[PDB]
C-alpha cells in the first residue's frame, strides 16, 4: 500500500536527480579530501531510525486555542495512514509510538494496518496525567504517587494495560511520564510523594517481559508548576536505579531548566548505562515542542556528537530508543514530522564526520580551540546531499516535503475526514 | 443580597474576635514604638481594591487536562455570584473584569446582576487569541498583526465591540494582550508584524472614549514558542508611547524572561507615566499563574515598594489599575483568589510600614546593608491583624475561607449546578 | 573580647523594654496556635552555622574589588572578626578555614581559636588557582585533569588540607573545583569524570573513621560550557560511588534558573546524601548574596525541608550548617552577623510549622490549606525569639547596631594597613 | 609585518587546490540557486568588525586568572598582537581602546596604529573600577553615585575619552558601568536613573558633531540585585532622551535567560537607535566566550536581521560592530581570529538567504518554508567564501594553522617577560 503514489515521487525525484548527483559528488570529492568515504556515511544514515509519536500527526493547541487544519485524523487509523506517509517519504520513521487511552483499538487491526503500511510500533506510552470518561479515580492531584490507594492502584492497572497491548503489537517498552507534583508549597511532602511512586513502578516492573524496557521520563514543570516528582535526571537516575536492569530514563530535550548542558546528562547517562532513549524536539523558553533542530540546530549536534561517541566505541548494549515528541500547532503535522526526521539524521550525518581521533587529541593536549573547530568542521559541513540520496535509494523522496506538497494528500485526506471546530484549551 | 449568610459571617467573627483584638492591640504597640499609627494603616488597606477576572472564578486547566471540581459556573452569571462571595467576604474585590466573547451576554444584564451583587466592573479583556463560533477570519497566524488585513480589521472591530460593552456597564478601559508571534524563526518579519500591530491598535485608540484608558499587555512567550509581537517591557513602552496620552503598559507578573527585576521595570514605566496597571499573579517557572504570592512573597511586596515610592516621591496622576489574573488548576477557585486578594493587601500594607526617612538616608550614604534592613523590618511585619481589622470593620470576614467553608457555599452551588 | 562587654550590656538594656513587650506579645501569640515560645527559643538559642574564613574579607568580581578600611591582614586577623560574629550572634561558633589562603601553623590556629572561643568546621581545599612553586598548573583542571601528575599534586594538596584539620579539630573535607570546559568538544564528559572518581578514591582513602568528604556541585563558572560536577545528579553519583564517607553539599547559589532547591534537599536527605549546606541568596548566578536578602521565603522552605527530616525521624541526620558568600558592598563582618541571623530565622519559621494540620492537608490534597499552613509559620515576626536567644547567651539583642556602637571597625581600620 | 610574508604565502599555496575545488564547487551549487558567489564574496571581505585592546591578552573570573605565554603588557604590545589578528583575517582593521588601561600618548598610539595598519574605533571609559590616586571610589557608582563630586569625576573621565579619541581618529564613546545594587532597597531606582541620565547629558554636550555616544545594557554583574542600565527598553529610554548622537550597544551575552536578541535588534533598528553590536557567545550568563562557538544559529538570526536592514539601509542604521569577549583557556589571538572568521560566517550566511522567497512565505504565512527558507542559507557551508576572501586581501586561508606555522606565540613569549618561568 502506498500512501503517496509512486509516480509523483518517481517524477520528483527526477526532476531533481541532476542537482543531487552534482552536489553529491561535489560532497563526496570533498570528504574524500578529508579522508572520509561519503558512501561509509551514506549506508550508516539510510538505517538510523526514529519513531513518531502518533499523537503528533494531529494539529496540537495550547491552554489557550487550538487551530485545527483540514484533514484532521479522526482516530489512530487515521494517524497510522498518515505516519505511513512520513516514512514512504524519509524512509528514517519505520516506527510509531501509541498512547493510549488515545490510541486504543483491537491489537489485532493496529497490527495488521501497520503491517500493510508498512509500519512498526515502538514504546506503549501510558497516560495518567488526563481523566477518561467513567474513570472511577481522578488524577487531578496525581496518579501513581497520587494519596489515595485506590487512585494508584487504578493508574498501576492501566500501565499494565499498556504493557500487554504493546506485546500483541510488537513493542518491547513502556514509557512512563506523568504530571504528578504539585502547585503550591506544603501541598506534597516531596519524599513521601517520590516513595510512593517508586512503589507504584516496582508493581508496573513486575508486569514486563524479560525482554522489555521501562521508560520512566522527567519534566521539570508543567502541569505541575511548583514542584514535580519526576523533575529531573537525578531523580530519573534514582528510579531507574532502584527498579531495576529494565528500567531506564527517557530525555526529552524540551524538559530542562534554562541553560541546562543537555548533552552531559546523555553522557552522565550513558556512562551508567541508564540512558533509555530520547524524545526529540526542539525549544526556547520551556517545554515548547518544536520542530526538531528549527531553534538550536548545534545543541542537537552536540547530543549526537555525545551518541556517536559511544556507537563509536565498545557499544555495550547501547540502543537507545530515539522517538519524535512535538507538537505541530501551526504548521501541516506531516510536513513538520518530515523535516524533523529530517533534523535528526542531519545532526546525525555530522556527527558522524567528526574526526573523533583528531578529537580525542586535542582533548588529550588540553587545546580546547582546535579541539571545539573539530567539531565544527563536521557541524559546518552541509550533509543535505547524503540525506536525499539515502532518501532516493530507499524508495524515498529527494525533498520529501515538495513530494508531498506535489501529491496533494492533504486535499486528499480533507475530502475524507469530517471538519473540525477551532477551540480552547483552560 | 449576600451569597453569605449574614449569621455565618457574624459567628465566624464572634468566634476570632477575641483574638483578633489582642493581635491587633500587640500590633498597635508595636507599630506605636515605631512611631506607626495603627489606625492609619487600617484606613488605607481597607480602601485598597483589586478586580478580580471572570476566568479565574471557574477551574483552569493546561494543555494535557482540565480537573473541574464541584459547582463549576455554567456563565458568567453564575460567575458574577461567586465574585460577590469573595467581595463580600474580603471586601478587597468590589469589581470584576470581563472577557468577551467568553462572558458575552446583554450589557444591560450584567450591570443589574452588577448592582444587585454589590459589583462594578474593571478592566474589559478583548480575546483574538483564539477562534470563535462563526468567525470569518482564524486568529491562527495573529489577529491585530495578521498579515491579512481583514484579519486585522475583524480583530480591530471585536475589540470596538469590546468597547461598546464595556460603555454599557460602566468599564473604563479595554486591555489588550494577543498571542500574536512565531513559533519559527523567519516565519515572521519582527518588524513588519509590529508594524501591522501598531496600525491596528491606532484604530483601536481611534475609537476609544476619552475617558477610557487603553492597556497593551506584554509577555515573553505562550502562545508563541520562538517570538511574541508584544514581547517585553520595552516593545510595550514603544506601544504606549507611540500610540497616545491614553495608552498604557500592563505589567503581569508572570510573563517576563527568568530572573528579571520586574520591580525596575515597575519603576522605569511609573517615571515614564505608562505604568497602566498590574496582572497580579505568581511563578516559578513560566507564566505559571499562581496564587499571588504563594511562591515569591517579597516579590510581591518589593513591587508594592516601588507603588508606595512613587507617592512618597510625589508622582502624581498615578492610579495604576490593580488586577488580578491567575489559573486556579488544583484548589476551589473561590479560596484561592480569596488568599489572593489577601496576600496583595498583605504586601500593600507593609509597603506602608517602611520608614521612607530612613531608607532615604541609608541609600544617600549608600549603607546597603541598612538599606535592606530597613526594607525588611517592614517585610517582616504580620500584617494580619491589619488585614483581619479591616474586613471585620467593613462587613467581612477576620478569615475568609473559614467562614467560606462553614456556610458550605460550595456544596450549595454544586447543588445547583449541574456536572 | 573582641567588643567591650559594657558595650553589649548597654545596648542590650536600651532595647530590653521593646523586646520583652514582643516576644511576650508573640508568646501569647504562639501559644494561642498551641506552641510553646520557650521550646523554640531553646532550640534556636543551638542552632550553629559555621563561617567562612574567606567571607570576612571584602569580595571583588572579575571587574573590580573595592576594599573597605580595616581589610585583615591574614588568617590571624580573620579569626579575630569571626570573633566579633560570634559575640554578638552566638550564632556562629565554627570557622570553615580554606587551603592555602589560609595556612599556618595547625597549633597555633587551634590555639588562636580556643583562645578565642571559636572552633573549625570543614576544611576546604583550593585547586581552582594557582599558588607559588606550584609544578602544574590547574588551567585547564585538577582532580579531573588529563595529566596524571596533575591529578596527583591535586590529591595531595587535599590530602595536607586534610592534616591541618586533624591537627585543629575538623571533621571533614569541603572539595569545590573550577573543573570543566568553555567550549564542546574541549572536554570528553565521561572520561573527565571518570578521572574526577579515580583522585576523588584517593582522597577517599586519607580519611580517618570519623571524617566525611563533601563535594560540591555548581552549574557554570569559572567553567562555561560545561562543569565536572555541575548537579546534584552527577554529585550523588559521586557520594554513592566513593562510599559511606562521601555526602553532597548543597550550595543555593549553584543550581540552574528556576530549580526547585528545596526538592533537591529532600531528595538528597532520602538517600542519605544530604552533607551539608553553603547558605547564600541570589537573584541571577552565584552571586553569594546575603542570605535571605533575596528570596527570605525559599530559604525558609529549605529549612521546612530540614525540619521535616527531623520531624519523619530520619536516623542519623546531622547536615553541615556553613555560610559561603561574597561581601562586595557592605561591612563583611555586619553582612555576616545579619546572614547568620536571617538562617536563624528561617529555621525558627520552620520549627513554627503546624507538622499535624499539615500532614492532615497533605493527606486530603487540600493544597490551600496546606500552603498556608506554612504560610502561617513564614509570616510569623520570630525575631523577638532570635534577639531574646541571643541575650541568654551573651550575645547582642540588635547585633550590628552593638557593632556599631562599639566602634570596631575604625580600631581594627587603625590597627591594620591596607596593602 | 607580525607575520613573515613567505610563511602566509607558503600555506596559501599547500591550501589552494583544495580551495579551488571546494570554492567552484560551492559557486555552481549557488548558481544553481540564483546566487553569484562573486557578489557574497565582495562583501564578505568588506565585513569588519573592531578588535578589543583588551582582547588579546589572557582573560580571567573571580576565581583565577592562568596567564599563557608572551602576553602582551600595556597597550603597545597588545597593538601588535592585534595587528597579526588584521593580518592574517583582514576582518579587523580597527582597534577599540579603553581607558586608562590603554593611556599613553596619543600621538605615539596613532603613529602606531599607522604603522601596523590599524586604526581606531570607539573608545571605552572605564568607572568600574578604581585607578590608584582616584579622588572619589567608584565602589557605591560612578555616573549614577549618589555623590555629586563622585558623578562629576566620571563626567570628566569620560570626556577626557572623548579627547584621546578625537587625537587618534576615533568617532565614538562606549559607556558600560556597573552602577547598580546588591540589595533591595539599597538604591532607588528611579533617582539612580535620573542621576545617570543626568551625567550622560553632560557627556553628550561634550560630544563633537561627528561622534557618537553609545551606551551598553546589562542585565547583571558586577550588580547583583539590579542594575541601572539593566536592558534594552531602559536603553532606549536613554538614547531618545540623550538625542540624535547616542544609541544602544547590543551585547550578545547581557540578556536574561531565553531571551529573543534578534528582536531586539529588529526593534533598536526599527527605532533608529541600534548603535552597534558586541560579538560574543555564551550558554549560561556573561560568558565571553568566542561568537558562534555555543549557539552559532542565534548569530546567524542576528545577522539575518543585519542584512534585511543593511540590504534596505534604513535610516540611521550604521551599527558600528566589535568583539567583546574573555578568552581565559586559549590563545587569545587564535580566538579572535576564529572568533571574527564565525562573523563573517553568520554574515555570508545571511547574504545567500533569498529575501524574495523568504518574504512570500511570511505573507502567506507557511511557516514551515520560511523557516526552511532561512535553513537553506544557515546549512550552506560558506568557509570556502571566508578564505577565498582572505586569500585575496592578503590574509590567510587557513588563519590559525598559519598563526601556529609562524611560531608568533613563541617569539613574543622571548621577547616578553611572564611573572615567573
Ligand atoms: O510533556 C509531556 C511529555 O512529552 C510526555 O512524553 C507526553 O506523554 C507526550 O508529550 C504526549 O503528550
Ligand atoms: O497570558 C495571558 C495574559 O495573562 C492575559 O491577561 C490574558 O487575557 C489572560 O491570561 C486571560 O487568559
Ligand atoms: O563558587 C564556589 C563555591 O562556593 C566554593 O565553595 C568556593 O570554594 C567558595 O565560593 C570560596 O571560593
Ligand atoms: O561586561 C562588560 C562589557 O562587555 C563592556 O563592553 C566592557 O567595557 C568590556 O567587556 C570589559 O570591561
Ligand atoms: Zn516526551
Ligand atoms: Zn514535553
Ligand atoms: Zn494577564
Ligand atoms: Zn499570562
Ligand atoms: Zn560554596
Ligand atoms: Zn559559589
Ligand atoms: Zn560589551
Ligand atoms: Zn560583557
Known sequence: ?????????????????????????????????????IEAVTAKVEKFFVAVPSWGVGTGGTRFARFPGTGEPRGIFDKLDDCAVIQQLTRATPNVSLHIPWDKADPKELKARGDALGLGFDAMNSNTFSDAPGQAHSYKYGSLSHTNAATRAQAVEHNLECIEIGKAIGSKALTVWIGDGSNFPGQSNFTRAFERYLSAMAEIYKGLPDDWKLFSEHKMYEPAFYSTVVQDWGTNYLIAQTLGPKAQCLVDLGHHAPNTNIEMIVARLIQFGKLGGFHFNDSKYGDDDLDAGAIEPYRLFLVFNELVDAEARGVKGFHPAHMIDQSHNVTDPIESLINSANEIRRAYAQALLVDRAALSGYQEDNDALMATETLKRAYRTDVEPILAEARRRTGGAVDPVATYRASGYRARVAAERPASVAGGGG
Not at 527526477?14 to 548527483?21: F, G, P, V
Open 1 to 37: 500500500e502506498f500512501r503517496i503514489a509512486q509516480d509523483v515521487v518517481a517524477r520528483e525525484n527526477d526532476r531533481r536527480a541532476s542537482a543531487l548527483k552534482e552536489d553529491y559528488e561535489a560532497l563526496g570529492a570533498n570528504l574524500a579530501r578529508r579522508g572520509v568515504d
